[PDB]
Amino acid sequence: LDFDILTNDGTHRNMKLLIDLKNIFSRQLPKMPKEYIVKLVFDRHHESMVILKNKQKVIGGICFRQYKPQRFAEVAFLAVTANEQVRGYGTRLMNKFKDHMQKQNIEYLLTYADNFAIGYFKKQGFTKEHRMPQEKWKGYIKDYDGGTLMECYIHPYVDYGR
């Protein structure tokens, strides 16, 4: 069981892993246009951290986009394959992600949430009330009136997972 950053380097190996992850995303996010998931996952700005089982099988992951100069990143997609849910993987992934973000000098995590989703990120430490100056993400992260923008502060020396 590994949580590795999956590089989109045009190799058969990584490409396959990214595709498997993309398929888990669409199967688990039915309201999301599959081609839209494809677009983001493989674009120049996004990165993915995968939950790798037996160093070959993808069972989950999180797609995100860092805004390095601004020191914040947006979570695009998060998911664990159906037959592997409710085993603590999703929470362990999020913790590995925060630790990686802390190491990447990222100060805040932002993500849009709807319905149930909101409850999930609240349990993952995200809040509706932001402490990050609005004008900081304005212009970088699209402002949708239809979704709840949530944020998680990444303190420089709090221990998240490992």
């Binding site: 688990q28 996010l29 039915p30 309201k31 999301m32 979570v75 695009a76 997609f77 998060l78 159906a82 849910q85 409710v86 993500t111 849009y112 949430a113 709807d114 319905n115 149930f116 989703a117 999930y120």
Partner: peptide, 8 residues
């Protein structure tokens, strides 16, 4: 992160 309830 499009979500419509469910999600186990």
């Amino acid at each position: 992160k499009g979500l419509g309830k469910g999600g186990a």
